[PDB]
Design a protein around this ligand. Sequence first.
Ligand SMILES: [Zn+2]
Lengths: 30, 29, 108, 109
Amino acid sequence: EVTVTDITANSITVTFREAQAAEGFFRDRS
Amino acid sequence: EVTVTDITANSITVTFREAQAAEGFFRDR
Amino acid sequence: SEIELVFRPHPTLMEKDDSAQTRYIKTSGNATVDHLSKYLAVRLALEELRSKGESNQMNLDTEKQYTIYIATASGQFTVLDGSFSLELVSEKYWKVNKPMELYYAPTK
Amino acid sequence: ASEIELVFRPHPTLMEKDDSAQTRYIKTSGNATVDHLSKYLAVRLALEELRSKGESNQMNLDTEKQYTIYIATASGQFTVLDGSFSLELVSEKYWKVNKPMELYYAPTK
Ligand SMILES: [Zn+2]
């Protein structure tokens, strides 16, 4: 799965998406 | 829409589902 | 599953400053009061963490166990034993064919 | 790029080995700061602990450190990342390679 977490710092909120493996998640750089 | 959580007590794991309103969640009676 | 719950803070044992937001819950009738108390503790803790995550504060932290009640005749609330299944609670105390109304408060 | 990929691990020497600590694969915005990442880690660790307690046979929820973020640069040494820096800036200044950015954490103390 991909967890999604919103985190605020210095009045700006950002989203972190996290997976348990790179394969299928990270983009192809070839 | 629906939150799902597994909770264990006494070596039995139970699944809880929670919503923000009854309609469309609870069954018709 | 088959047990339906309308779950609210104990009207009087609340902390005034806390949300009174009703929760709508489905689970197996075999779930016990202990499961429900623990579920509440976990859900509140998760909600608090996410809230702190979204707040401007940089520092987080680590709370409570809960007692579960059901309203009874008359003008009172009965404490439910943690070993009771929710099915038993509905038959013994609630009885009517409607989602069951339960209440919670921090265990003193 | 507006999006950034991170491979996020405990610092290899500033933290004791822990087989229970998995490498994290993360995507976020280039405009996110190091501060967002440090706060994210604390929140994620706490969420995971809560959920683990939820599924364990423990009836009592016990359940918090602050973290510093590091990057290993070309020299092989580590740089402590300023909390105000955007991850975009970190990538341009310290990583400089066409690969997911490898970052590390250890407690602030
Ligand atoms: Zn970029």
